[PDB]
Amino acid sequence: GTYMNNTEAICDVKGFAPFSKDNGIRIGSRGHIFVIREPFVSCSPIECRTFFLTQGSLLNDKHSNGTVKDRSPFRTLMSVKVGQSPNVYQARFEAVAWSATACHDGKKWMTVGVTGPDSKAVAVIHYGGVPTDVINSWAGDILRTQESSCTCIQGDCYWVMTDGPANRQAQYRIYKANQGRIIGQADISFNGGHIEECSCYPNDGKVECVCRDNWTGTNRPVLVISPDLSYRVGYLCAGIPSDTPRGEDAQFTGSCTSPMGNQGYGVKGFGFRQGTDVWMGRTISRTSRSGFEILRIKNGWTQTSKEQVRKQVVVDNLNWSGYSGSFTLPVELSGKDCLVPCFWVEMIRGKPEEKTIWTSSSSIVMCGVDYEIADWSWHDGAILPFDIDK
Amino acid sequence: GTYMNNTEAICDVKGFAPFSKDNGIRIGSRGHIFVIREPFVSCSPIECRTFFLTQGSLLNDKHSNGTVKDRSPFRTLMSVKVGQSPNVYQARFEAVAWSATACHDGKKWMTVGVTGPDSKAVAVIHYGGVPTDVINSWAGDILRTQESSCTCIQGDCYWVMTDGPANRQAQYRIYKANQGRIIGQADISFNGGHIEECSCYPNDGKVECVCRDNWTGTNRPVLVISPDLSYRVGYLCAGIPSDTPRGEDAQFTGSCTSPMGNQGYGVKGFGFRQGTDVWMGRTISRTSRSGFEILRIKNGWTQTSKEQVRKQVVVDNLNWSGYSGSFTLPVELSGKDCLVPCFWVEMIRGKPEEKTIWTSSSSIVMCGVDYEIADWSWHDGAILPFDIDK
Amino acid sequence: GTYMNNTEAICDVKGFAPFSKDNGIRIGSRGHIFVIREPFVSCSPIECRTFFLTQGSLLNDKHSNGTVKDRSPFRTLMSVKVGQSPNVYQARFEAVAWSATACHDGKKWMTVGVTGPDSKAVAVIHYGGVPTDVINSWAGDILRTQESSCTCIQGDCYWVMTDGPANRQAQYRIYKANQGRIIGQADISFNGGHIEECSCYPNDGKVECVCRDNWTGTNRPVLVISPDLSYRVGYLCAGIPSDTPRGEDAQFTGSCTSPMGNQGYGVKGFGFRQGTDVWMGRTISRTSRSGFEILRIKNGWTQTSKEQVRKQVVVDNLNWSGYSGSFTLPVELSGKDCLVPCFWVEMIRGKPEEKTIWTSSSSIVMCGVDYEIADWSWHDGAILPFDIDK
Amino acid sequence: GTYMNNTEAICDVKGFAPFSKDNGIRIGSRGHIFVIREPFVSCSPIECRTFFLTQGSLLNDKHSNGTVKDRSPFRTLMSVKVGQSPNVYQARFEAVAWSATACHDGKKWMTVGVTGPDSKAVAVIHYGGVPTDVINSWAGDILRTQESSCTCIQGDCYWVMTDGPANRQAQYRIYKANQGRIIGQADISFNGGHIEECSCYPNDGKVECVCRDNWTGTNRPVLVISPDLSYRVGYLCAGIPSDTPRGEDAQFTGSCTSPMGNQGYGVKGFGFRQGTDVWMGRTISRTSRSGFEILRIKNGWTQTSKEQVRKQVVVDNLNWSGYSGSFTLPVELSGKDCLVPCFWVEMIRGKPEEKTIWTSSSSIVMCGVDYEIADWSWHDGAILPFDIDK
């Protein structure tokens, strides 16, 4: 019955402690577990949940054949409580979706699920368990969205969407809803820039997003959104690249405005502003989706700094990672007067890196704390290949 | 503690967006999923649920042998939340039933389940999880009902029942209950007409139903029911047939009063009044239960019109469909001042079309929206035959 | 927060309509379902539940080997909602038990589970999910209880227990509890009589029980209990036997006071008083646990009557039955001003009648209605033997 | 919305009645059940739950290979209701953990899960389903905690932690939290003493703990903690040893202050103060983790007594036992004016005692009652080896 404010500042944190780990793929060796992608977390005032995409198929079953396309007619968004595996019998249905975002305004859950044909996809907004509004593709080229938590401030929820080429100039938009109804939108002017799969969080009454340039950028785009949908758009200032693939730190020069690095492709990732500093997540490998570390760059939010002051390893470089994204703990759960910054790391198993017929992932979730946390590796741990691969 | 009014008008909609898809049969390749028929949807003020019939058997098990008769002593009505698969461990028991209808009056769930012998079946009304009243066969020939959501207006719930031949003159009745107790009934006078498996919804304080003629009609009967159980009965005026099998549109002349088409058999289907227009669902094939499209015929509710102004494809003609039925979103969930029109499409897999020992189905659920939605096909997607078929 | 009165009269009913059927054994062919006995029903103001005994073993698993003794250290009482199968993932734990009874006082659930050695068993009373009190064997010979719903009137709950020989004079006691604490007990004086496995229900502010004589009686003992624990004890007056095994009706003379029939063994069963009439359940076969019918004998509660005025078949004589027991619907669920009489019928599959290594059962539940209901057979339906038997 | 006082005295009990038994390993033969350790119980005002450690693996699956180390990156704390098996589809995620404790303050659940590298582990405190605070290793040698219920008194919760050698002098600390935030801590001075895996309970407004000396003691350390974190520390006075391994009773002399017995190793166990008497749990074997009995030693809490006045066997010496720990029933559930003393007994199956590739355990839970309870054995009961072992 009450909207979450989410107007607070992000907590200044010295490190990240383990929240949860689902072990979904290990369990899936025998249990009944969805083949998934993007196990992103979002929290209501009472609990955090892991959302994920399914193909309607289970681990160790013929339907887990990974030849089916990502944007299939079978693709749905579902969810479970954080730390639970994406198993069938604990799962809540959310939306038909091959692209998704989701957030809670303090009263109910809002989800957006994109489905339909690439040429004219439909984004169906769900609020409180029923469809409430719709967004059709405005540019006829794979309407898509964050694949992480959206952001609700004082009852209104915001998210970023892209429509157009995945490797050249696309079009980018900010949408705003209240109670599952669209109340505003704004086109993001970003000539020469590329925005994909934004990882957002609230901070000081604004929505801050760290996204993925899939065009020429090895640094991450940053978009700061005000409630009237005026915005600031650019790149993460830091003189260290955090996309994948990327070049070496020493061969990089940062920019607050422009993409640097001259490389294609990318991986969904996140970053958290800490005053003027930044925490930036990245895969350990410069070239592959293996390992995951997080770095604190002093003045990295505002300057082309290379002054690294913290580093914490969460998945070693001997293990596969994947997508990563941001969310915050509601003050109603943390009991703090700031917004605890949190992230999930997806850990991809199977194709193409390993010899299976399938690909899935599991997650480790970490939350920002007031203390330095030691390095370690909470990797997926499943033993490949599986019975079905034989 | 409060009855749903459901006195509003049906929303005028330009198209239908995907609500949910369960992927039950794909999941059933490995998971523990009921073999089902008729995954019909009905909503309470807090959630929508998929109801379905079971035989007590699971996909990929010997008991899924489809030699067992529909009207078996094992047949039960169960339910899950919309988008969930009809799996064992999320299922709620409802009623012993080989024919069913179900609706929520705003306080509790009412279900009617028909079981017993063809010569003298018993319809047991359940309210709030216990049997409350009973209807015995009045004509000794397979007492049966809607296989879709019933309809509650201001606390009283209504439904249509048939008793008699499935291919000649039968008898048709309207029943009315409050709190699971029969409070009224009326015989439907329809000489030369045939009523089966009505798909109803509320509109303007009346219950409107689009049914199935299984006698000689390729157009659908329409029954409009007032709370005092006076009624209007006839056929969907539109000069386009929507039953299956049917002839071609060009070879058809509509009628508001009489069955046209001169063909036997049929398939459960639905239609929504839009002022004087209609949305009519139908299989794409004229002869088989494959594909599903919905058409808007201008003035089709009141005139023998052939003026098609909209068409949306939801399951292509390369894929199996089946039953379809109507329900509405409560205003308490939609947040609208009208009754959002919604439908589910059952997608039948296995016998007789495919070489398996079993038959089941899955669903796609769609809800009316204020925008045109692109064609696509959210088909079942299961890969037949299964392990058990070998 | 409110005690159920349960002071009303039992509804006069003309027949019994199907409430629920779990299909547990059919589902267990593939699903994860407890091997059970005694699927007895009891209702709280919000729902009815099926309770049952487990051995910690699942259908189609080696542990379902039926060589394990009934009174094992593994035996537990668990429960699910009525109509659900006794599956692992929907089950609620209740008590360690190889004999049980259970009832809800309107605020919480009370269960009594008997376990321990035959020479000195312990009956642990559970209230609201924790042990609250205890009853040790008073006669050192298999302390045991109803295996059906106990009975709560105005907050105090009553049940019948036996301790001693199963084929000669035993000792019988009535216990009374409030909030899981023993507040009273009474020895039942019944020289020459035998009381086992009572099926009780409330009626007119008293607890009426129809039990099993396992000594020499083919008619059923009847015990009527007042809240001060004064009681009346005897036999069901009717001149028709309802135990199994029994002789033929024509060879029987009834008695209100004494056992007739001169045969050993028995089967748990039930009966409902209707003014002075009775509804009596019994297996169809005189010698085996097959079939189930219910008969109304005019004046059968008070006279040695043979005047049968109703008969309804619920499981034909081609199918296995088993235990049966009584319970009532709370007025808070039925919405009636009387106590709707209800019964469950257990349907035993496997050993000794069939060639399997295991034995389990499933249930059909029926509730009294104001109308005559047609005969039919809602039998178990599982296809024996199973994979494990091969 | 209300804190539990837990200031009462422990109930004086004459024996222990069975609360629950999960049969997890028997069920796991076919069902989907976590491979676990330490099924410890803790209660909120509404229910008791079994907590347990998992490796992300299921019984009868290759991942159950017991070669994985206890302190793995996969190890998580999860929980179910008491008596339920640690199955996947009923499980609630709690914390990433290879060591754990958990308790409810009356408003919410607090859990502490230790994970990370031995050299610098991190203990993450969870309150109400999110991380709230952190404790890093203060001595760089396997930070660890109780593996049983912690203890909440008047809203503040306390627990004991160890950091250092498992076979020589370590360091021991008491921590105190409110609402998941550390509010106090104290170093335990215990030169020559060893504290591991404390089993605590509240009594008279203090926290009493009976722990495990893994250094030279066959008697158990006792630590009594006051809310200001002043404490009393020593050994269980009784002239009978209760650790495992241990020597014979006749060869033992007790001490209130010092470890006796001169043997290494140990097993988690418990004890309950009864005025000046004690109930002490122990394995029946002096050398192995088989059997479980509980003894009442008159004046054993305060004197080097050998006066055994009660003994109750719960698992015979023909069956495997394992860890044991203490918890109490809230007065809000028991309805008593004292704190009912309760314990769980873990029953370990598989390696090293039996020829399997895996090790798991199941539990029997017992609660103190006002009556003598007969000996019996509620052992695990699973039939080894399993399919996977072949």
Ligand SMILES: CCC(CC)O[C@@H]1C=C(C(=O)O)C[C@H](N)[C@@H]1NC(C)=O
């Ligand atoms: C369409 C743009 C979207 C976001 C960059 O791209 C996705 C990213 C993916 C990726 O980074 O691997 C995989 C998705 N299947 C999709 N596919 C491709 C080929 O780009």
Ligand SMILES: CCC(CC)O[C@@H]1C=C(C(=O)O)C[C@H](N)[C@@H]1NC(C)=O
């Ligand atoms: C009895 C009338 C009812 C509704 C037309 O018929 C049902 C329709 C069905 C159908 O349309 O296929 C299948 C049902 N098994 C049932 N059977 C037959 C043979 O008609």
Ligand SMILES: CCC(CC)O[C@@H]1C=C(C(=O)O)C[C@H](N)[C@@H]1NC(C)=O
């Ligand atoms: C001990 C008395 C109790 C109730 C008559 O008996 C039970 C009845 C049973 C029965 O009627 O088959 C089976 C139970 N396993 C138990 N066993 C025997 C041999 O009598």
Ligand SMILES: CCC(CC)O[C@@H]1C=C(C(=O)O)C[C@H](N)[C@@H]1NC(C)=O
């Ligand atoms: C590290 C101290 C902790 C508590 C004594 O020890 C544990 C006890 C265990 C035990 O008693 O068997 C097993 C745990 N895997 C761990 N391992 C060892 C080798 O001691």
Ligand SMILES: [Ca+2]
């Ligand atoms: Ca890039």
Ligand SMILES: [Ca+2]
């Ligand atoms: Ca027709």
Ligand SMILES: [Ca+2]
């Ligand atoms: Ca008898």
Ligand SMILES: [Ca+2]
């Ligand atoms: Ca020791």
